[PDB]
Amino acid sequence: SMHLICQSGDVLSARYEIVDTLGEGAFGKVVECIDHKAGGRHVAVKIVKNVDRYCEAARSEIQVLEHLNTTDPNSTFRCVQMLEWFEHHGHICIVFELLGLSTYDFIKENGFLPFRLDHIRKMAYQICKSVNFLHSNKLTHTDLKPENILFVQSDYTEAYNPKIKRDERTLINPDIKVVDFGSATYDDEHHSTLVSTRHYRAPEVILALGWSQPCDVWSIGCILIEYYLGFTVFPTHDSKEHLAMMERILGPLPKHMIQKTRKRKYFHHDRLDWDEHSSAGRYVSRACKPLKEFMLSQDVEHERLFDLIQKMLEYDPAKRITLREALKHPFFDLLKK
């Protein structure tokens, strides 16, 4: 059991002393450690469950990272640096540079308040650039979400905010890196139709129409909205409900995608088989609404962000904006000189 080897004070590989837990996922956990063979430098160690599927994903992640960290040794494109890996009591352990809080945890610890728009702009730009780098190297991440975007330094300043009537944390440096390459898939590898359920899943994934780089762009759209609102606009883990939410926010799915899907169960006469008047249906109607109605201001920068988000949430992955195009969107003009 992981609990036997992941506690504060334990030593891994005769080297890494566990300080505390940084975070957890399906795979196991990530712990901060003091590296006694590198002068006491603190690092992050990802301790992977001794379970086939996660061992496999960990081996894949290692191969992806060897490739990315070799192609981009200075982390210009902001993928986390893997320092090494080892085994410990049958657990794969991957050692990474220590980063700050995930963008998820920062939001959580700031009372679910959104990020300020200028930070959203910088972070969005970096995410697009980082993931575009992956896209340039024939990779799709597939598991982009706020937990997998981390601040390089999550240090903040804190003031009372009269407008919200609560104390607010403001981030000092919004620079990020992307983590978790355990699902990342190369173009020449099999893109399994089977993908497991998230808030950040693209419609082509849910409908098993095949996926590739565009599914990442969808996820990034979901992320940006969450950064803007402080909460997710797809809070479900049921697929059909997810599709009903999409329809409420973005309009009906394209007929041609509905026609092509193997997932006939969701539909009836090429319309989503969804009772709006069920208790779940009434929840979807009242919680979800057309995308633009989530805007907190009509100011032009808000309108620019939402225009980009809308393009990232194009249903048809063949028509969805690419990250290469996203990087030229007007929302990013303020970052250029």
Ligand SMILES: Nc1ncnc2c1c(I)cn2[C@@H]1O[C@H](CO)[C@@H](O)[C@H]1O
């Ligand atoms: N290198 C790192 N430095 C600091 N924290 C890290 C990492 C990595 I790799 C992951 N995490 C934390 O663990 C959570 C699940 O991966 C993430 O969501 C995050 O909270």
